[PDB]
Assembly symmetry: D2
């Protein structure tokens, strides 16, 4: 039965805190499996400044860390342990979200509109791309 | 408790058929009130080139009421509305006035063209102050 | 050399007045050919509720030709066109068919509402294969 | 007279190479001043993984470096030296582009649609935001 994708940006509490009741409600409808995905973004510009000569941490360690934080966030959702799965990817958030939505495949993607503290843009760049490009239903949470 | 706005384009059966399961589900979560709205478009271009709106509104209301019979919803929790104007304008205005907690809309009319999101879905998902479910 | 497509909404004087200086400038860079297009909208909603298009097309052509007289462009480098359909559809189709090297469009009808980019400008800037100047 | 903003992402040759003839042509119309801006993007997510405990280079040095590369890119435009100015900022590219467009103020912003090598998205996140949110004309170059 139903598969729901919940992209999580571990860098912000509220983008997560907002979706909780929606993800739970959508899941309870028919005991769906809920896949949570955090994406460690690629750094093309910093790359051009010589930062990877210059050094960022190993991607293997960055993913292990991002995964541990995602795992803590997942536990904030009241969902049975067998209906949940944690994923970490590397890339543009929108690219990897859309890739996973296709690969699973997702029947619904549940995302926040944007970061709370910034009002100006009514839709964030990832939310906007995902809404437009997903092949499945997309719930934009406000 | 919750209020759900369901904009319906009475001229497209598939846009309407597509959201049925989602509306029914979303309503049942907490016995929400469901408002259906259809909007008779403004024709400003035609105005530049030179029946009664009363009558068009009654026909649209009649067709929306028949469409509502395709949804399993409690009769006492449902309301139908007809408006005149740009659809996105009147959808957004009703979302603020109700106010709506969710708007449920289909993405676009699928066809042989390259678009992925319709002009009204795009404006609604962007400008609504509440959550928006874009159905595919 | 270059081909410039200039979609005109004949019903809005300001959308048209706003691009005049940009079209004139863009043309003069290299003595470009300028194609003006106005699109008579499709009314599928009205079709669901139940004069001649020949006649509407001739009136629109006539109004577009009068609008073209507000531009300083060489008469031999200008062409006017009228189409029927969704404006963005027919704009994009003509941009591919000419093909256009640039499309020059105004952003939106400014008014008391929150929108910043009109439905046709948005689709054109996104889907055109060539450069697009969005005029403010 | 006229002021043109040309946002440049120093991390890609073609996003730059494409705009050249357009920027020159727009400038020659009436001897406009051309402001070039590169934005060093803020790294909220990497921040949450402890990378700034963990270390990226000093922002002062990152800006000096980004500026030196921008300066080389600017010289690829056939423009008089007194009608050109280089800027570096820190933040979201779209935020800082829009800020500068307002502050100058810009009469036109000239931007590429997206990165060449990625076809999927017809408009990049920064291009899309700038087109929508700029108060002035925006030329999207393809
Ligand atoms: N790195 C990420 N990994 C997983 N999901 C993400 C990531 N970034 C964003 N998202 C998803 O997209 C939602 C909306 O965030 P988005 O990035 O589009 O807004 P924003 O941060 O305000 O925009 P911008 O990133 O353009 O500043 C998030 O709530 C989350 O669901
Ligand atoms: N006239 C209308 N009245 C009420 N709601 C509408 C109307 N038109 C569209 N909608 C709502 O918006 C949805 C998406 O339709 P939209 O018009 O955005 O797609 P489209 O017709 O493919 O795009 P466009 O009208 O740009 O060509 C519909 O499922 C419906 O929920
Ligand atoms: N009927 C049309 N024919 C030809 N070009 C048009 C037509 N309508 C709009 N355009 C082109 O698109 C531009 C922007 O108009 P647009 O319709 O996108 O704004 P809007 O009317 O504010 O939005 P909407 O029609 O969504 O409410 C116009 O300046 C014109 O270049
Ligand atoms: N860091 C930057 N500083 C200055 N301008 C930028 C920056 N990033 C993008 N731009 C401007 O925006 C244009 C289009 O790039 P955009 O980032 O929107 O496309 P993309 O890289 O394909 O998208 P994404 O960044 O969403 O992957 C660039 O050509 C450039 O003019
Ligand atoms: Cl926005
Ligand atoms: Cl699209
Ligand atoms: Cl907008
Ligand atoms: Cl796109
Ligand atoms: Mg973000
Ligand atoms: Mg429609
Ligand atoms: Mg219009
Ligand atoms: Mg980019």
């Amino acid at each position: 039965n139903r598969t729901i994708l919940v992209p999580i940006d571990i860098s912000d509490s509220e983008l997560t805190q907002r979706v909780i009741s929606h993800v739970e409600a959508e899941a309870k409808i028919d005991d769906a499996k809920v896949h949570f995905l955090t994406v460690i973004p690629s750094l093309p510009y910093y790359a051009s400044l010589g930062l990877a000569s210059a050094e960022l941490p190993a991607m293997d360690d960055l993913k292990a860390e991002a995964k541990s934080q995602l795992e803590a966030i997942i536990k904030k959702f009241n969902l049975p342990a067998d209906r949940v799965q944690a994923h970490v990817a590397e890339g543009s958030p929108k690219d990897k979200i859309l890739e996973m939505a296709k690969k699973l495949p997702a029947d619904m993607v549940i995302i926040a509109s944007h970061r709370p503290d910034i009002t100006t843009y009514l839709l964030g760049s990832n939310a906007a791309a995902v809404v437009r490009h997903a092949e499945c239903s997309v719930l934009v949470v406000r």
